[PDB]
Amino acid sequence: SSQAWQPGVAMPNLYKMQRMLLEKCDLQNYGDSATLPKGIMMNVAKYTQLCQYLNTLTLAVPYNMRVIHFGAGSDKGVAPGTAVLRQWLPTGTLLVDSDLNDFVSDADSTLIGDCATVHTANKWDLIISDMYDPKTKNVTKENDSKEGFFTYICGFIQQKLALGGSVAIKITEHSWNADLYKLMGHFAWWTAFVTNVNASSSEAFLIGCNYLGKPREQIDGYVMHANYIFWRNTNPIQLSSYSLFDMSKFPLKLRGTAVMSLKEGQINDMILSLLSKGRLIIRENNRVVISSDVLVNN
Amino acid sequence: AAKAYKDYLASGGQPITNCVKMLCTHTGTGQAITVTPEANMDQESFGGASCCLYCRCHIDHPNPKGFCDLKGKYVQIPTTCANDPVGFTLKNTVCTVCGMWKGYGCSCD
Numbered sequence: 001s002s003q004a005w006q007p008g009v010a011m012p013n014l015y016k017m018q019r020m021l022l023e024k025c026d027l028q029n030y031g032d033s034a035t036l037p038k039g040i041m042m043n044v045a046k047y048t049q050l051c052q053y054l055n056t057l058t059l060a061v062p063y064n065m066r067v068i069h070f071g072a073g074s075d076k077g078v079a080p081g082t083a084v085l086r087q088w089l090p091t092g093t094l095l096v097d098s099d100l101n102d103f104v105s106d107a108d109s110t111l112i113g114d115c116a117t118v119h120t121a122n123k124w125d126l127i128i129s130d131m132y133d134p135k136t137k138n139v140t141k142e143n144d145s146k147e148g149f150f151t152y153i154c155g156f157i158q159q160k161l162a163l164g165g166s167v168a169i170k171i172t173e174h175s176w177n178a179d180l181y182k183l184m185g186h187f188a189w190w191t192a193f194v195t196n197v198n199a200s201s202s203e204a205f206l207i208g209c210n211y212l213g214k215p216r217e218q219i220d221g222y223v224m225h226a227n228y229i230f231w232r233n234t235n236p237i238q239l240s241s242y243s244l245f246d247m248s249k250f251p252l253k254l255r256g257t258a259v260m261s262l263k264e265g266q267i268n269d270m271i272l273s274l275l276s277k278g279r280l281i282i283r284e285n286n287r288v289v290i291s292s293d294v295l296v297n298n
Numbered sequence: 299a300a301k302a303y304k305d306y307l308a309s310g311g312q313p314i315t316n317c318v319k320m321l322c323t324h325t326g327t328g329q330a331i332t333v334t335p336e337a338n339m340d341q342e343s344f345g346g347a348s349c350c351l352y353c354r355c356h357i358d359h360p361n362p363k364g365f366c367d368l369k370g371k372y373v374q375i376p377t378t379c380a381n382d383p384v385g386f387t388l389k390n391t392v393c394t395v396c397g398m399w400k401g402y403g404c405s406c407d
């Protein structure tokens with residue numbers, strides 16, 4: 001298994017082209033555990049492998065890039081994922097994180113509360129989500145599209161993600177949403193990525209690379225999630241932390257990607273070409289302001 | 299605050315855990331506090347905020363302005379003291395010339 005030296009495994013294109021029915025996820029390696037470097041947390045290992053994978057894609061990387069991270073709080077009250085993102089991202093990158101409960105973070109700004117209580121008029125270049133509700137998993141009922149925080153993620157992408165931007169959203173067998181898969185078709189490229197350290201889990205990151213703001217391809221989310229599970233059920237992934245031992249090429253290379261403010265009437269086919277190659281970001285560059293709502297009562 | 303922790307260690311004092319240890323090459327400059335992990339062969343790098351007593355306890359920082367020199371940065375700790383990063387950062391201090399830990403890398407003499 002040559003995949004063991006990779007940071008993880010991306011869903012092969014042929015699996016994306018099937019029309020499968022949703023089945024239970026039954027992983028062969030379920031229960032196994034990867035051997036992490038001494039004293040390293042699973043959350044640190046997982047995010048390190050996600051970033052090592054993102055390095056191989058055509059992410060747009062402007063000056064003073066804007067990154068937002070959802071579901072960043074751990075049970076212990078810290079933000080391991082945020083620490084890895086800050087290590088990975090160019091120095092000076094604006095990094096904002098968020099979660100439902102309080103936690104200590106290395107982010108430039110931390111937002112506590114749900115989506116309905118936070119607001120910004122600013123656009124972002126990269127969205128990372130580790131949001132996940134453990135009570136979502138229920139094997140005694142049908143596995144339908146989830147319509148909670150995922151509806152907010154979809155709304156955030158379609159309104160606050162800059163053209164040329166990218167996303168990495170955590171999903172699982174039971175934590176998923178049909179509209180989010182459909183929205184993957186609005187990017188120049190997409191995949192479902194499984195980290196090698198957590199390959200015994202149904203977890204994956206839906207990765208949308210270079211947002212076009214329009215459907216490049218029509219994707220049925222119900223079918224694509226079924227395709228994802230079929231892939232996982234028929235392709236055992238060997239648990240591996242091998243990639244964690246070589247961090248020499250870890251930092252995201254600065255590309256100094258151009259940021260331009262254009263209108264929908266100016267987005268021609270040559271602009272789409274630049275967006276698709278991660279050579280352009282379309283958004284304004286105003287001061288970044290985030291609002292936090294407070295319900296007041298006596 | 300910082301005084302109580304020193305004495306808390308006595309009588310089987312439990313050291314603050316869950317400090318976020320980072321993956322790195324361990325071929326860094328070895329400086330105390332940096333914008334990215336800079337641990338050498340004898341150090342571990344941790345996310346700054348998770349090693350700051352003031353951040354962890356959700357209390358004000360000693361500077362009148364309220365600035366934290368750990369949050370958003372990485373702190374290098376000797377591998378021998380990696381079991382207690384918060385404690386090590388309190389006790390020791392950084393050299394304002396070379397930016398190394400005093401008695402743990404600093405040799406401006």
Ligand SMILES: Oc1nc(/C=C/c2ccc(Cl)cc2Cl)cc(C(F)(F)F)n1
Pocket residue numbers: 068070071098111113114115118119120129131149150152153156160290291
């Ligand atoms: O407009 C706006 N929405 C949000 C957050 C939405 C949200 C979606 C999914 C999940 Cl999982 C969590 C959240 Cl919080 C955030 C912001 C701001 F942070 F940029 F101000 N501004």
Ligand code: NA
Pocket residue numbers: 085086087088089090091251333334
């Ligand atoms: Na960095």
Ligand SMILES: [Zn+2]
Pocket residue numbers: 347350351352353354359366367368369
């Ligand atoms: Zn602090």
Ligand SMILES: [Zn+2]
Pocket residue numbers: 393394395396397398404405406
């Ligand atoms: Zn010195």
